[PDB]
Design a protein around this ligand. Structure first.
Ligand SMILES: Cc1cc2nc3c(=O)[nH]c(=O)nc-3n(C[C@H](O)[C@H](O)[C@H](O)COP(=O)(O)OP(=O)(O)OC[C@H]3O[C@@H](n4cnc5c(N)ncnc54)[C@H](O)[C@@H]3O)c2cc1C
Ligand SMILES: Cc1cc2nc3c(=O)[nH]c(=O)nc-3n(C[C@H](O)[C@H](O)[C@H](O)COP(=O)(O)OP(=O)(O)OC[C@H]3O[C@@H](n4cnc5c(N)ncnc54)[C@H](O)[C@@H]3O)c2cc1C
Lengths: 245, 238
């Protein structure tokens, strides 16, 4: 619960806002289904109220977005979204900042990674099957990342490499599946220890590291894309500090 | 690539895979699928070692035109005649029993090709190897199963980026080489610890990925003996 985490939380809601705004513009039923599922899942991981009411009020919010006027502009949708979230008792959904950038997306992806590892490290005896289900939702969330802003290069790249994140989500799933059948999980401090285990080791804070290293990989790779020589990259030690992990 | 028993299986599995791909061309139900198949098949034969480029275009053009009403066994006879007539007998597979092992072999085959290319690159062929690695990314992105396993396809669609990510790591290394040389390290732990690149990186990545798939299928089914890098390096004389 640090200053960078506070940015993350607000970017998470900005991303969710801009996602449901697209529902009214959707040009196919498949995309409508895709958008509204994703938006429901995102709010499900967001903490807005206290779960039974939350999930039902989100359904109301999603249903109102599906129906809103396709001929509104973005700023009009924002007006009526702010009213709708107020009357639904969902002012927690309201983003403080509405300036949408690549940092909005990245923040959302890092937030999601922070959620995975807190659920996993506080997984106890009885909640094992429940986390197993949340991990499935997380895989669908990362498979269907919308950029919303225009960047065809970026969307082509992510479709190519997003399987690196999902892979590690499945590593967790195997670790939880082993824990259910006896072999408890030993949390280790580094990617290299889990790597060596190749017997149930899982890195503490695994997805923060995975999303952090992936984020560096994208930035490294864009010098190839535009043909330039590269420059301060984010480090793991530094990253843990900013987030007090 | 060191010639061993298992590597000889890989090479024949690779050709069998490539045969079964071009059999799909006459059946294609969309221009997009046709272009995608012929491209992959051209790419696959480009990495095969069989003038060769031109005759492979002829082989590909003949399979695009082949009768759609043929069955597989007839296509197989005509293909054997065509590859003979074009002086491409090195394209014909010795065995035609298509299983999951044929696909895996082909994927570890391509992983062996990447590593060799990379380790034996000179400063003059740097741009060339970069060009091949981009062709390799397309190959792994577009892996067809051919056999029926809808669950397999969905799963690979979800996690294939794990392999392509590691191809991109190589391009980042060759790009730094173009401006800091790459130091080859022997272990994934050494490369991941930090311009270091693991020697035989893709054979380890593909081996690790292979184990992960088999691990994961017990989840998929609600239900001993896996492959190790030491044992794998030995089988292949790495
Ligand atoms: C999924 C995705 C795919 C993308 N693909 C491409 C592409 O193919 N080609 C292209 O040109 N651009 C791509 N981008 C955008 C690109 O990665 C940057 O966001 C953009 O180039 C802006 O550069 P920047 O340094 O100003 O912002 P960024 O560095 O990317 O983000 C700014 C913020 O992110 C934080 N940050 C920086 N590095 C890290 C890190 N490793 N881990 C965690 N936080 C970090 C910092 O606090 C900084 O405040 C992609 C973005 C996303 C979210
Ligand atoms: C891309 C791909 C995705 C797949 N996804 C799924 C899925 O989601 N669900 C499912 O049930 N099945 C899936 N399969 C099939 C599965 O992986 C096995 O091939 C199949 O279940 C048969 O198991 P097997 O033990 O007989 O063969 P395998 O264990 O797959 O391997 C047979 C041969 O491969 C060699 N080998 C074995 N392990 C390794 C290793 N780690 N590294 C290198 N070589 C090895 C050995 O020489 C062995 O002879 C997939 C296969 C492929 C190629």
């Amino acid at each position: 619960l640090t200053p960078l985490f506070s940015r993350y939380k607000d970017s998470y809601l900005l991303y969710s806002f801009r996602l449901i705004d697209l529902l009214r513009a959707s040009k196919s039923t498949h995309l409508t289904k895709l958008l509204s599922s994703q938006a429901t899942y995102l709010y499900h991981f967001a903490c807005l109220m206290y779960k039974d009411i939350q999930k039902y009020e989100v359904q109301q919010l999603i249903e109102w977005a599906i129906n809103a006027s396709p001929d509104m502009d973005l700023q009009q949708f924002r007006i009526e979204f702010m009213d709708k979230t107020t009357e639904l008792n969902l002012r927690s959904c309201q983003p403080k900042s509405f300036t949408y950038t690549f940092t909005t997306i990245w923040d959302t992806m890092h937030f999601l990674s922070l959620i995975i590892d807190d659920m996993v490290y506080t997984a106890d005896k009885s909640s094992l099957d429940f986390v197993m289900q949340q991990l499935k939702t997380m895989k669908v969330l990362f498979y269907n990342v919308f950029f919303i802003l225009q960047c065809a290069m970026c969307r082509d790249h992510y479709m190519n490499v997003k399987g690196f994140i999902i892979y590690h989500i499945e590593l967790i799933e195997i670790a939880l599946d082993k824990a259910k059948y006896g072999t408890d999980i030993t949390f280790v401090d580094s990617y290299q220890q889990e790597t060596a285990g190749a017997n149930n080791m899982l890195m503490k804070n695994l997805m923060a590291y995975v999303s952090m290293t992936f984020h560096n990989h994208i930035n490294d790779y864009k010098w190839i894309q535009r043909n330039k020589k590269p420059y301060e990259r984010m480090t793991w030690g530094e990253y843990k500090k900013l987030l007090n992990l």
